[PDB]
Amino acid sequence: SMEQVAMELRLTELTRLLRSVLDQLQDKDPARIFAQPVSLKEVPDYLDHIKHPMDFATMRKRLEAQGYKNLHEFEEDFDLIIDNCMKYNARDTVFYRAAVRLRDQGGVVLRQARREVDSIG
Known part of the structure; x- marks a missing residue:
């Protein structure tokens, strides 16, 4: 149907905008601490601690x-990156501190993304 196509175009355009959002958030992680899944070879107990890993x-x-x-789904996954790290790692670690900085800096980007998603529909 033409309606299914229109819906698919909307999803494509959201994907476009989320790709730009993802690039901007990942720039706030210049150390690449959050780039890849935590390695279960290197942290074998991880899944005992963290039930929904994300990266x-x-x-x-x-x-x-x-x-x-929708943007809520995407934000859920970004918040998992931050929140998983802040639980597994102590306050005095480079990992925890990187997550705090990513959360603080990412907030700015996400605030305007929400306005864009609502604005463009």
């Missing part, structure tokens, strides 16, 4: 399959 590569795979239906 920027995994988000990018989901994004490119148009797997985010």
Whole structure:
């Protein structure tokens, strides 16, 4: 149907905008601490601690399959990156501190993304 196409175009354009959002958030992680999944070879107990691991590569795979239906879904996955780290790692670690800086800087980007998603529909 033509309606299904229109809906698919909307999803494509959201995907476009989320790709730009993802690039901007990942720039706020210049150390690449959040770039890839935590390695279960190197942290074998991880899944005992963290039930829903997340990282920027995994988000990018989901994004490119148009797997985010709305901005809330995408933000859920970004918040997992931050929140997982802030639980597993102590306050006095470079990992925790990187997550705080990513959360603070990413807030700015996400605030305007929400306005754009609402504005363009």
